[PDB]
């Protein structure tokens, strides 16, 4: 491991056969500064506060993704079609801050050790699917080249509340359901 | 399960002592194995595994590619630091400190940035060293961290507990007191 005061990825370029699909982001000290949405072709910020630190011409990401596509095809052949290994993801659920009845909060579902970078993370309120107030990070990089992804659920703490984070990944025998322990 | 093949390219910048010491390492990865790399401390592309040899030789033979990559140490790493990182490094989010019993007493230090922090427990103004257990630093993903520090309580309901927190965003340490009802 390289020792340094700070580390950034400018940027993380991911491209995979399944889909196929890619991802483009810049990270600083482990957090996502911005990303390029390859579908709408726009540089975007999951946290608008960081837009003041600089924009980005999305064409740079689009060009890199085209090169990444070319490289992947070539590497698949060089590696005799060795497929990715489905690793077992690790899931933890916790709140952003101390929970107080009636005071808005956020539940956080961390899915670590992800590979390949394909996963479905959903939220269940007393067993039923919930989509309102849900958002997530991009696949964030790790030095061992696997990824981690975090999903968020904004909610109003209430009596009798029941929450679970459901994770689907090929590395799991069956979907993983993680109950939030308040 | 569907088969998948993954390519990852990471243009990594390492900084130490401001921008006095900077190192660029671009990594080419197939699935989870890095096969080729450009290290600015080396100056040329190197094959990390046999599968990267074709590229290392090809890229080093292309003047525009090699010179362009060598220049990225400055054009990417150092200039990104000037335009964005210096400012991000000035970001300060003050932690919120809350105490509650779970015997264990838990001091929850939440929503702070950067990640450097110091949390200490005090009992009747006496710093506690034993009976203290802390969770690792927790990355929330939204540019804030949190950390929990537990303390083994004494049988005396009269003892006053204080969670002392030091952080770069604070001119003065935050201290929160707790005493049984």
């Amino acid at each position: 491991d390289i020792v340094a005061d700070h580390v950034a990825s400018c940027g993380v370029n991911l491209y995979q056969f399944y889909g196929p699909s890619g991802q483009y982001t810049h990270e600083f000290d482990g957090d996502e500064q911005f990303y390029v949405d390859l579908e709408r072709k726009e540089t975007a910020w999951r946290w608008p506060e960081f837009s003041k630190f600089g924009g980005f011409d999305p064409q740079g990401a689009l060009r890199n993704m085209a090169v990444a596509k070319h490289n992947l095809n070539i590497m698949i052949k060089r590696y005799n079609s060795t497929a990715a290994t489905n690793e077992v993801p690790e899931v933890t659920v916790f709140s952003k801050s101390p929970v107080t009845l009636g005071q808005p909060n956020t539940l956080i579902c961390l899915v670590d050790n992800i590979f390949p970078p394909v996963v479905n993370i959903t939220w269940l309120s007393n067993g039923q699917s919930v989509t309102e107030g849900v958002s997530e990070t991009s696949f964030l990089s790790k030095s061992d080249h696997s990824f981690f992804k975090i999903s968020y659920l904004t909610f109003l703490p209430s009596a009798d509340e029941i929450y679970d984070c459901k994770v689907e990944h090929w590395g799991l025998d069956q979907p993983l359901l993680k109950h939030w322990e308040p | 399960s569907p088969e998948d093949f993954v390519f990852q390219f990471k243009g990594m910048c390492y900084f130490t002592n401001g921008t006095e010491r900077v190192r660029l390492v671009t990594r080419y990865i197939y699935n989870r194995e890095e096969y080729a790399r450009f290290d600015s401390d080396v100056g040329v592309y190197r094959a990390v595994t046999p599968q990267g040899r074709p590229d290392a030789e090809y890229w080093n033979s292309q003047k525009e590619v090699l010179e362009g990559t060598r220049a990225e140490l400055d054009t990417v790493c150092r200039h990104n630091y000037e335009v964005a990182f210096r400012g991000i490094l000035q970001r300060r989010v003050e932690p919120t400190v809350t105490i509650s019993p779970s015997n264990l007493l838990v001091c929850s230090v939440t929503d702070f940035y950067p990640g450097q922090i110091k949390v200490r427990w005090f009992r009747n103004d006496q710093e506690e060293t034993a009976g203290v257990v802390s969770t690792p630093l927790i990355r929330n993903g939204d540019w804030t961290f949190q950390i929990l520090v537990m303390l083994e309580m004494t049988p005396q309901r009269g003892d006053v507990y204080t969670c002392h927190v030091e952080h770069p965003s604070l001119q003065s340490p935050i201290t929160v007191e707790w005493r049984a009802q």
Binding site: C10, V67, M75, K77, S81 | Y45, E57, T69, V76
Partner: peptide, 20 residues
């Protein structure tokens, strides 16, 4: 101000191996 970024190098065609 648009931020700079590293460019992914274009792989050499043909370098051994065979699709399976």
């Amino acid at each position: 101000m648009n931020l700079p970024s590293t460019k992914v190098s274009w792989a050499a065609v043909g370098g051994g191996g065979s699709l399976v």
